[PDB]
Amino acid sequence: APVNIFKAGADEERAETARLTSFIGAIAIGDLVKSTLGPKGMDKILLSSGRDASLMVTNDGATILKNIGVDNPAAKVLVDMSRVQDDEVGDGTTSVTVLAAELLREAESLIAKKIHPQTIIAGWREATKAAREALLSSAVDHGSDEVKFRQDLMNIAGTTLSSKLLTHHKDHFTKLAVEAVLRLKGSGNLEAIHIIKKLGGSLADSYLDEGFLLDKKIGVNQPKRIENAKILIANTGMDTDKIKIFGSRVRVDSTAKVAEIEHAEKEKMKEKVERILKHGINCFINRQLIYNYPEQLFGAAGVMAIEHADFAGVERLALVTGGEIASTFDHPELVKLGSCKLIEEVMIGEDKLIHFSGVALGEACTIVLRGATQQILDEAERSLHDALCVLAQTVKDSRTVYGGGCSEMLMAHAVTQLANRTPGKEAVAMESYAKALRMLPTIIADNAGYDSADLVAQLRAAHSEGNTTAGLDMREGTIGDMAILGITESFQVKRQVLLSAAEAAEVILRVDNIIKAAPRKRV
Amino acid sequence: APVNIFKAGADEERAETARLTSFIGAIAIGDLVKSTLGPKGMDKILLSSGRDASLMVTNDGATILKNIGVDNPAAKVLVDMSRVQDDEVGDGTTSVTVLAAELLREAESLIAKKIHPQTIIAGWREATKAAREALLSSAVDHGSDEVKFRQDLMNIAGTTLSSKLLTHHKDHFTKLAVEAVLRLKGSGNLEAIHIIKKLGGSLADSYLDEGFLLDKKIGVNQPKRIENAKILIANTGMDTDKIKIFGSRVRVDSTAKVAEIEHAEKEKMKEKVERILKHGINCFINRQLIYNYPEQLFGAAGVMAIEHADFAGVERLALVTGGEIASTFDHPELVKLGSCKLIEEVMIGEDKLIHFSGVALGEACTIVLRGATQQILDEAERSLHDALCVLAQTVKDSRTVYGGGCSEMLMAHAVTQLANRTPGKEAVAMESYAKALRMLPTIIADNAGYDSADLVAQLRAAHSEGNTTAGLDMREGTIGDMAILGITESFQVKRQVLLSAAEAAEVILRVDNIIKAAPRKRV
Amino acid sequence: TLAFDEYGRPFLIIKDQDRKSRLMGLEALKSHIMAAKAVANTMRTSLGPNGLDKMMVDKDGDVTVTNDGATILSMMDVDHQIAKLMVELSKSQDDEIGDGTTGVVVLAGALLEEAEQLLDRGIHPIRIADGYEQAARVAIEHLDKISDSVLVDIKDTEPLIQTAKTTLGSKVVNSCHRQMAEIAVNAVLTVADMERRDVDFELIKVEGKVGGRLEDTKLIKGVIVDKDFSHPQMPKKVEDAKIAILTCPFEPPKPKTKHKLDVTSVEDYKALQKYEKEKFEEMIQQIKETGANLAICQWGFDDEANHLLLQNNLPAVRWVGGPEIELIAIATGGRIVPRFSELTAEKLGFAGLVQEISFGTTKDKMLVIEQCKNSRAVTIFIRGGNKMIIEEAKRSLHDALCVIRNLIRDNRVVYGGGAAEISCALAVSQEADKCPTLEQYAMRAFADALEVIPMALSENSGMNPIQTMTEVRARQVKEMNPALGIDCLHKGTNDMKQQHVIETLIGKKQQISLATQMVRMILKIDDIRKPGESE
Amino acid sequence: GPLSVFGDRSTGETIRSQNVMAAASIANIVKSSLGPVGLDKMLVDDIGD
Amino acid sequence: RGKGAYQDRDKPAQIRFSNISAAKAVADAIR
Ligand SMILES: Nc1ncnc2c1ncn2[C@@H]1O[C@H](COP(=O)(O)OP(=O)(O)O)[C@@H](O)[C@H]1O
Ligand SMILES: Nc1ncnc2c1ncn2[C@@H]1O[C@H](COP(=O)(O)OP(=O)(O)O)[C@@H](O)[C@H]1O
Ligand SMILES: Nc1ncnc2c1ncn2[C@@H]1O[C@H](COP(=O)(O)OP(=O)(O)O)[C@@H](O)[C@H]1O
Ligand SMILES: [Mg+2]
Ligand SMILES: [Mg+2]
Ligand SMILES: [Mg+2]
């Protein structure tokens, strides 16, 4: 195919530069986000060449790979791998990128050993099957005795926020992340926790609101605070209805009848508001816009009117007040109203927001992130999003494993025990699978500046004879017990790091020909 | 220096792309000539873009690197390293290139291990000192009992020619290489063995001439063969002398005196030839050109006249006949003449050459290389030059070591035995030195198509407990004794492979900054 | 406005003023520091025995791996006039002393980095420059406290070897750290005039040939030239050579003017043959009457004179260079004779083993002179594995030949390894309080910049800079200050007197003097008048 | 090192001398049209007005 | 003994000085 090429502007390579470009392009992705892994790793700042560059600092490996725009074909497999890891569990996107790159780096070492690439695939399938049994047998469940499960949930949020910008804020941001999912008391919808980013103040000034915050302040001549009110929301049109009959006009003979029709239009718009206040309410939230004619009617009756909050803002108010959407007002005995105590307006960062203090059945939260710059607020929002998504799945799957390098040495030990019970064809591929699992505590140990050649060697000697909870202590720089220090991760997060990296390395290693087509508008 | 760059067209890099471009450019040189190492390795064909491209196939690693013209700065150190290896010992230019590249490939593995590069230099200096004692204690000397030394010389030429184009010609070309140096009986001048390349015939039709061959055939009216002649050579001017007086004219008054001067000029040229034939000779060799006036004088006296052989052609005739140069003819009792039996002309490839058959004190040879194409003759000349240079130094240094991977495992065993008696800072660098020494039998084993992962493992298990003469058997594909099969190399060849690769890898590893200047006429 | 007046006329002062560049501002001093710190940060990694080398590529594509600070800055294409003064600073250290060419650039970049924070506090740049002169004067007087040597050039060569090991310890010759250090000691003492304390480097010939190894570098007492025996049957070994050095070519004598010699009859043409035949027999007999058995000639030989050398058993070389035969007459004790008629037995040279040595497969055949008689000229033959290790060893051993020359000029030494810089930094800090009137901040910036050189040795050795320097500096105040520095493998204790890290006094005396004066010429400048594009 | 703005920056007494010449460029125009001995000017446009 | 040696041969030691020198130009511009 290179000799006597039958292509126009397209090129290809077979078994010489195919695996060469696949191993170079995938290691350079993994070596890029290598410095961001661990609780002592640095962060990246992403910039463009211009034309609203919109600089966005991120430490999470999914947000780095989704914005760099790699031109390598085999590197897009690892870029899409970190996107699925953020969409499923929301954590380990950096850990699954280095692990999939360390598998292909050990596969580059098997180039000169003349090992068949299908032997490495069949050797890694038996290695990944033994690695699933190491995490499944070491998972710690939590059913009853809930005072130890809430302590276990703070160890999950303490491990996730340690590898982010919120380093010296674990005394505050752990309570902001555990109690946010604990106030859901149900499914992890991940949209009732509305994060509001406001400039001014430090990250210690951020807090979790006991009620709910909103924008689009209360009318013009309406009351600003009503105590012991009944909140009724809506999703209906207020004025300029044009009610659902396309092709309907007002064909009259004189202009005196147009004055009678427009008075009949305002009488039906007034009668719609009169059906709303028969419920006995004091606040009104409409998803659509409220014009001036129903605004005067709510202001004359002493009723609030919040106009055009959000499409998903009426869903959070329905989960924090315990009511319903109620888009049709014709049955006051079948419409459930919300409950609150204070609807006072608070000022956060020279902006008046509507505080719904003292609400009943409040299965929704509002995190008020305050930072020094907008770059910190964009990073702390993604750092909190990577912490709330794991706790939303830890309450659904209570199985937890010991992180901090302890889980990877347990997975590498089960592969090494079965590497000695195999013939020599697939045993060399299983030894490279166990060395790549030991690189994940090696990257964490070397990012702090510790002796990674000795600490991982002490972890391999500890896990070889007992010590199932022995891991890497990044606080002092030694080997400690992970059950005492409280460094644990979720089972489903660590399983998706192991499983998705083994499936993505299976695709790139099986590629022997990269036939790229002719691009458009590139000359 | 990248930040606020104060250079015009020059660029540089410090500790990030400096060692990156040094490790890429040096491995790609070693991976290029990796396929030409061993008795089953293939050859390369070197071509240019045009304008008298002059294709020259070579298997020797020095001739490949001296013609490619690498643009990498660190790759030129390994190119110049193989140039000295061809000029000093004439062999191992491919072995010193792969060994210097495997050291830097193991040094690239110490990048992620955070080893200081000065620790690798101090670790390799102790590793090279342990490797010198392995070759020195295993060297086999040969003093008297010359029937074992001539058998040992055939094992040196049989090992060198096995890795070249002369594969199935070891029954003939070994005798052409051993007997050529054996007829020198003195210093290895490496110019008395004049190699003549003629087209037509196979490589089995090549032979070593018992006498000497020459060009510039014998005169016009002179005899072509004289039995039992006395050869006298010369380095003097025959005609149009203009003898050593710059600024001397013939200022006469009449044209009759010009006829007396030009007759006096031809009488002194006749008297010079009359001083030559007073020695009682039958052949005459002049380094300069012989014109028509002394050519008639040698033809009338029955004396041969070989005009303008070569500048180094009279040196080989002085070593093959036992005479002297004799540029001045005024003392016939102080000029030693040559000796021969037949000066008949032979025809090799439709070209008449002067054969000096039956010469006395013949310390010079003539190899008549005959091949199918010119590409085979250019390869067989360099293959014989790589074999005659080792035998010219084996007669000066009779110490020989067992090659074929046996010498590399002896050197790697002495480093590994002293790597366990060292602290862990330098012991990791010594283990990488021993792994690169085991790569040299791994390249030889994998070029034939054998299982290189098991044969080097069988060599390491053999040398760990005895078996100092155990090596790689490339004939059947197993492990055999090198003293029985007769696969030996010289001690000075194997020492220069170890020593020059350790010094060249010391230079490139100590480079942390590559500051290249702005080139001229490159835009 | 620029290029226009307020009355509408064009305002042109100098030619091509639109393509000019002029900066007075407050960033003109800031642009000089940021251009000089990047040169000092480049040379910081190549300091000490753990200093990594640099790969330099020329304009022709030639690659030279250099470690000395003189050749690194000289082979750059830096078109910056502030950094060009750092090139001449490292060149001035090489021309005068020749050991601290790397350390004089890191020290000059350290004085400018400490002056950057002093510039923001409102201090005048000449007031910092006047404060550095009062601070460098304390470093000169404190450096002359402990200094002693016992060199006698007879048997006490032990302080001379340990001084050269400090210079050769940072280069790539650490494999020959004991062998090559003794070569540079004996090469200086055999050619130096101890009555005048003058060393001539023209008598020390530094030659190099590829092949062999670094351990095959020998000190050849004599000369090493390219032997060019015109006869291939010449004897290649002379046991006792009576060397006849001449500067006349083996030919009939040709005058320097235009002659146009006239030949009229055939008796004059037969007189031409007998004139040259007796001239070649006269130039050969006049050498044999003196008892000579070896001839050296600057110019070429004739073919008729070549066979007359073999008949009389007189080996001779051909086409020797200009200063090459000047080294033969000193190594052999002979005299260079212009003509052949002035030859005598008193103008002959004496030599022992005169032979040529072929190196592998090449055809060089250099001269090896083993035996001599009170020679004042030596030749170092550097061998190696490639041309990168030989041209660096020519630069490494030249720094070892210079530190022995500095000991004959001044027999006072100091202790390196950062021990002299920490001790000099304490002397400026003690005199900064006597008195802290105006230049208190300028002297403390000098003492903080003198600590950059020992803390760069701690950075290249894998240690911590502020952890190791605080331990060494505190031990010199609690007791009397010893030779206390650092090392790479650290050799156990940190005593530089026990580790034998010996440097010259005038080497470090010129490091502080040249870096202070170069800082004064780059602090006392407030404008740049560089042009724009090239054309 | 310096400011990475894509425009142009001039500090010191350069702008302090340019603003005076900018004000004197306007004053030297209208100085010939002051008082009873002042004289009018001509303002010609590109279109010919 | 030296109690270890941590070789750091990587990029961001030089980019960290680039963020320092750029922020010093902003503070000196509005000084
Ligand atoms: N306190 C701690 N002790 C030890 N290791 C920790 C600690 N906190 C975090 N880690 C480690 O740091 C790593 C951070 O990975 P991360 O970049 O969050 O992966 P992802 O990008 O997939 O979320 C985890 O694998 C974890 O083992
Ligand atoms: N008969 C044999 N058995 C085993 N090994 C051999 C045999 N002949 C040659 N070799 C190996 O092949 C290699 C050829 O190396 P070569 O390319 O000649 O090095 P260089 O280019 O330096 O001369 C040698 O190192 C030798 O060990
Ligand atoms: N054994 C040692 N222990 C501690 N320091 C040493 C040792 N050997 C050399 N040094 C230091 O290394 C430095 C090398 O300086 P160098 O680059 O040679 O200066 P220059 O460029 O002027 O020749 C010296 O200043 C010396 O203090
Ligand atoms: Mg995480
Ligand atoms: Mg060979
Ligand atoms: Mg030095």
GROMACS .gro file of N, CA, C and O in nm, chain B residues 190-251:
model
  248
  713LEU      N    1   4.927  -0.324   0.623
  713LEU     CA    2   4.792  -0.325   0.565
  713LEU      C    3   4.785  -0.254   0.431
  713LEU      O    4   4.679  -0.202   0.392
  714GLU      N    5   4.897  -0.249   0.358
  714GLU     CA    6   4.900  -0.197   0.223
  714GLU      C    7   4.976  -0.286   0.126
  714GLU      O    8   4.968  -0.262   0.005
  715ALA      N    9   5.049  -0.386   0.175
  715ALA     CA   10   5.111  -0.483   0.086
  715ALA      C   11   5.010  -0.581   0.028
  715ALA      O   12   5.039  -0.645  -0.073
  716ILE      N   13   4.893  -0.594   0.091
  716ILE     CA   14   4.787  -0.681   0.041
  716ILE      C   15   4.702  -0.596  -0.052
  716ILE      O   16   4.600  -0.539  -0.012
  717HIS      N   17   4.743  -0.587  -0.178
  717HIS     CA   18   4.672  -0.509  -0.278
  717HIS      C   19   4.556  -0.591  -0.332
  717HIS      O   20   4.576  -0.698  -0.391
  718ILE      N   21   4.434  -0.542  -0.313
  718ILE     CA   22   4.313  -0.612  -0.354
  718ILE      C   23   4.270  -0.557  -0.489
  718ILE      O   24   4.244  -0.437  -0.503
  719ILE      N   25   4.261  -0.645  -0.589
  719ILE     CA   26   4.221  -0.608  -0.724
  719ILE      C   27   4.082  -0.665  -0.749
  719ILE      O   28   4.061  -0.787  -0.736
  720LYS      N   29   3.988  -0.578  -0.784
  720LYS     CA   30   3.850  -0.617  -0.809
  720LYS      C   31   3.826  -0.622  -0.960
  720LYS      O   32   3.843  -0.521  -1.029
  721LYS      N   33   3.785  -0.738  -1.009
  721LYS     CA   34   3.756  -0.758  -1.151
  721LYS      C   35   3.618  -0.822  -1.165
  721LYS      O   36   3.585  -0.916  -1.091
  722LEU      N   37   3.539  -0.772  -1.259
  722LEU     CA   38   3.408  -0.828  -1.284
  722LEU      C   39   3.419  -0.961  -1.358
  722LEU      O   40   3.521  -0.993  -1.420
  723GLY      N   41   3.312  -1.040  -1.352
  723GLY     CA   42   3.310  -1.170  -1.416
  723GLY      C   43   3.353  -1.282  -1.324
  723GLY      O   44   3.456  -1.271  -1.256
  724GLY      N   45   3.275  -1.389  -1.320
  724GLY     CA   46   3.304  -1.502  -1.234
  724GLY      C   47   3.237  -1.489  -1.098
  724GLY      O   48   3.188  -1.383  -1.058
  725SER      N   49   3.236  -1.600  -1.026
  725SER     CA   50   3.177  -1.605  -0.893
  725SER      C   51   3.283  -1.575  -0.787
  725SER      O   52   3.401  -1.559  -0.816
  726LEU      N   53   3.239  -1.567  -0.661
  726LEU     CA   54   3.331  -1.544  -0.551
  726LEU      C   55   3.417  -1.666  -0.522
  726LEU      O   56   3.524  -1.653  -0.461
  727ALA      N   57   3.374  -1.786  -0.563
  727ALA     CA   58   3.457  -1.905  -0.550
  727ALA      C   59   3.571  -1.906  -0.650
  727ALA      O   60   3.669  -1.979  -0.629
  728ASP      N   61   3.562  -1.828  -0.758
  728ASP     CA   62   3.670  -1.817  -0.854
  728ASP      C   63   3.781  -1.723  -0.808
  728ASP      O   64   3.886  -1.717  -0.874
  729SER      N   65   3.760  -1.650  -0.699
  729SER     CA   66   3.864  -1.565  -0.644
  729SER      C   67   3.975  -1.649  -0.581
  729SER      O   68   3.952  -1.761  -0.536
  730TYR      N   69   4.095  -1.593  -0.579
  730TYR     CA   70   4.212  -1.666  -0.532
  730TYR      C   71   4.316  -1.568  -0.482
  730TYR      O   72   4.309  -1.447  -0.507
  731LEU      N   73   4.414  -1.621  -0.409
  731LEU     CA   74   4.531  -1.545  -0.366
  731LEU      C   75   4.646  -1.576  -0.460
  731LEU      O   76   4.684  -1.692  -0.477
  732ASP      N   77   4.700  -1.472  -0.523
  732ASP     CA   78   4.809  -1.492  -0.618
  732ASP      C   79   4.938  -1.521  -0.544
  732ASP      O   80   4.969  -1.460  -0.441
  733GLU      N   81   5.015  -1.617  -0.597
  733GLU     CA   82   5.142  -1.653  -0.536
  733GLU      C   83   5.249  -1.547  -0.560
  733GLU      O   84   5.349  -1.544  -0.487
  734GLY      N   85   5.231  -1.461  -0.660
  734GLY     CA   86   5.327  -1.356  -0.687
  734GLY      C   87   5.270  -1.217  -0.667
  734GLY      O   88   5.234  -1.180  -0.555
  735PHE      N   89   5.262  -1.140  -0.775
  735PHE     CA   90   5.216  -1.002  -0.767
  735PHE      C   91   5.163  -0.960  -0.903
  735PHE      O   92   5.218  -1.000  -1.006
  736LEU      N   93   5.056  -0.880  -0.903
  736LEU     CA   94   4.993  -0.832  -1.025
  736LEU      C   95   5.010  -0.682  -1.038
  736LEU      O   96   5.016  -0.609  -0.938
  737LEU      N   97   5.016  -0.635  -1.162
  737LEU     CA   98   5.039  -0.494  -1.189
  737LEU      C   99   4.970  -0.457  -1.320
  737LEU      O  100   4.924  -0.543  -1.395
  738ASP      N  101   4.964  -0.327  -1.347
  738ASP     CA  102   4.908  -0.270  -1.469
  738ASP      C  103   5.019  -0.194  -1.542
  738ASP      O  104   5.137  -0.207  -1.508
  739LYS      N  105   4.980  -0.117  -1.645
  739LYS     CA  106   5.069  -0.036  -1.728
  739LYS      C  107   5.174  -0.124  -1.797
  739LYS      O  108   5.293  -0.123  -1.764
  740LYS      N  109   5.123  -0.202  -1.893
  740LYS     CA  110   5.192  -0.314  -1.957
  740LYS      C  111   5.323  -0.272  -2.024
  740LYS      O  112   5.351  -0.154  -2.048
  741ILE      N  113   5.404  -0.374  -2.056
  741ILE     CA  114   5.546  -0.359  -2.085
  741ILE      C  115   5.562  -0.303  -2.227
  741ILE      O  116   5.551  -0.377  -2.325
  742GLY      N  117   5.588  -0.173  -2.236
  742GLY     CA  118   5.635  -0.093  -2.348
  742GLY      C  119   5.562  -0.116  -2.478
  742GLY      O  120   5.442  -0.147  -2.481
  743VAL      N  121   5.635  -0.100  -2.588
  743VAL     CA  122   5.584  -0.121  -2.723
  743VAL      C  123   5.659  -0.232  -2.794
  743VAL      O  124   5.599  -0.328  -2.844
  744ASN      N  125   5.792  -0.222  -2.799
  744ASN     CA  126   5.874  -0.322  -2.867
  744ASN      C  127   5.969  -0.388  -2.768
  744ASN      O  128   6.088  -0.404  -2.796
  745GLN      N  129   5.917  -0.425  -2.652
  745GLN     CA  130   5.992  -0.487  -2.545
  745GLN      C  131   5.942  -0.630  -2.521
  745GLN      O  132   5.826  -0.660  -2.552
  746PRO      N  133   6.027  -0.719  -2.470
  746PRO     CA  134   5.981  -0.856  -2.443
  746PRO      C  135   5.879  -0.863  -2.330
  746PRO      O  136   5.884  -0.786  -2.234
  747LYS      N  137   5.785  -0.957  -2.344
  747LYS     CA  138   5.675  -0.971  -2.250
  747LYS      C  139   5.705  -1.066  -2.136
  747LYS      O  140   5.639  -1.057  -2.031
  748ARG      N  141   5.801  -1.157  -2.152
  748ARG     CA  142   5.834  -1.252  -2.046
  748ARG      C  143   5.984  -1.281  -2.049
  748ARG      O  144   6.040  -1.311  -2.155
  749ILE      N  145   6.047  -1.271  -1.932
  749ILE     CA  146   6.189  -1.301  -1.916
  749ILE      C  147   6.203  -1.395  -1.797
  749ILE      O  148   6.162  -1.362  -1.686
  750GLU      N  149   6.260  -1.513  -1.822
  750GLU     CA  150   6.281  -1.612  -1.717
  750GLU      C  151   6.410  -1.583  -1.641
  750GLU      O  152   6.513  -1.551  -1.702
  751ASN      N  153   6.402  -1.595  -1.508
  751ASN     CA  154   6.514  -1.575  -1.414
  751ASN      C  155   6.575  -1.435  -1.430
  751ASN      O  156   6.692  -1.418  -1.465
  752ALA      N  157   6.494  -1.334  -1.402
  752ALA     CA  158   6.531  -1.195  -1.421
  752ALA      C  159   6.572  -1.131  -1.289
  752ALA      O  160   6.545  -1.182  -1.180
  753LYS      N  161   6.637  -1.015  -1.300
  753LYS     CA  162   6.677  -0.934  -1.186
  753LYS      C  163   6.599  -0.803  -1.194
  753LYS      O  164   6.623  -0.721  -1.282
  754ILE      N  165   6.506  -0.785  -1.101
  754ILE     CA  166   6.414  -0.672  -1.104
  754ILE      C  167   6.479  -0.552  -1.036
  754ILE      O  168   6.519  -0.560  -0.919
  755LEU      N  169   6.490  -0.442  -1.109
  755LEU     CA  170   6.533  -0.314  -1.054
  755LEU      C  171   6.423  -0.212  -1.075
  755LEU      O  172   6.379  -0.191  -1.188
  756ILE      N  173   6.380  -0.148  -0.967
  756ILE     CA  174   6.278  -0.046  -0.974
  756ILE      C  175   6.345   0.090  -0.960
  756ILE      O  176   6.465   0.100  -0.933
  757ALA      N  177   6.268   0.197  -0.981
  757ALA     CA  178   6.324   0.332  -0.977
  757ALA      C  179   6.215   0.432  -0.943
  757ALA      O  180   6.095   0.404  -0.954
  758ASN      N  181   6.258   0.550  -0.899
  758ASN     CA  182   6.171   0.664  -0.872
  758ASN      C  183   6.234   0.792  -0.924
  758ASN      O  184   6.237   0.895  -0.856
  759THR      N  185   6.288   0.787  -1.046
  759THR     CA  186   6.359   0.900  -1.104
  759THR      C  187   6.293   0.944  -1.234
  759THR      O  188   6.212   0.872  -1.293
  760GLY      N  189   6.328   1.065  -1.277
  760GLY     CA  190   6.275   1.118  -1.402
  760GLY      C  191   6.355   1.068  -1.521
  760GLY      O  192   6.478   1.063  -1.519
  761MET      N  193   6.283   1.030  -1.627
  761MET     CA  194   6.346   0.974  -1.746
  761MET      C  195   6.372   1.080  -1.852
  761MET      O  196   6.487   1.102  -1.892
  762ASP      N  197   6.267   1.147  -1.899
  762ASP     CA  198   6.279   1.245  -2.005
  762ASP      C  199   6.206   1.373  -1.963
  762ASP      O  200   6.118   1.370  -1.876
  763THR      N  201   6.242   1.483  -2.031
  763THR     CA  202   6.204   1.620  -1.996
  763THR      C  203   6.233   1.649  -1.849
  763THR      O  204   6.143   1.674  -1.768
  764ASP      N  205   6.362   1.644  -1.816
  764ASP     CA  206   6.404   1.648  -1.677
  764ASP      C  207   6.389   1.788  -1.618
  764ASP      O  208   6.322   1.805  -1.515
  765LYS      N  209   6.447   1.888  -1.684
  765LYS     CA  210   6.458   2.027  -1.636
  765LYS      C  211   6.521   2.030  -1.496
  765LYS      O  212   6.459   2.065  -1.396
  766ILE      N  213   6.649   1.991  -1.494
  766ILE     CA  214   6.711   1.936  -1.374
  766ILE      C  215   6.747   2.045  -1.274
  766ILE      O  216   6.858   2.100  -1.276
  767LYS      N  217   6.651   2.078  -1.187
  767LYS     CA  218   6.671   2.137  -1.054
  767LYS      C  219   6.741   2.273  -1.054
  767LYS      O  220   6.788   2.318  -0.949
  768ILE      N  221   6.749   2.340  -1.168
  768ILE     CA  222   6.805   2.475  -1.176
  768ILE      C  223   6.696   2.563  -1.235
  768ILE      O  224   6.681   2.574  -1.357
  769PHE      N  225   6.618   2.625  -1.148
  769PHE     CA  226   6.510   2.713  -1.192
  769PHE      C  227   6.568   2.848  -1.229
  769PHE      O  228   6.629   2.916  -1.146
  770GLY      N  229   6.549   2.888  -1.355
  770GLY     CA  230   6.608   3.011  -1.404
  770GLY      C  231   6.735   2.984  -1.482
  770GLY      O  232   6.837   3.051  -1.462
  771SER      N  233   6.731   2.885  -1.571
  771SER     CA  234   6.843   2.852  -1.658
  771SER      C  235   6.790   2.835  -1.799
  771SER      O  236   6.704   2.751  -1.824
  772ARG      N  237   6.841   2.916  -1.892
  772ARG     CA  238   6.797   2.914  -2.030
  772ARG      C  239   6.913   2.876  -2.121
  772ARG      O  240   7.029   2.871  -2.080
  773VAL      N  241   6.880   2.848  -2.247
  773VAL     CA  242   6.980   2.819  -2.349
  773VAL      C  243   6.991   2.940  -2.441
  773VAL      O  244   6.914   2.954  -2.537
  774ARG      N  245   7.085   3.029  -2.411
  774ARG     CA  246   7.101   3.154  -2.484
  774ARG      C  247   7.217   3.138  -2.582
  774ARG      O  248   7.334   3.152  -2.544
   0.00000   0.00000   0.00000
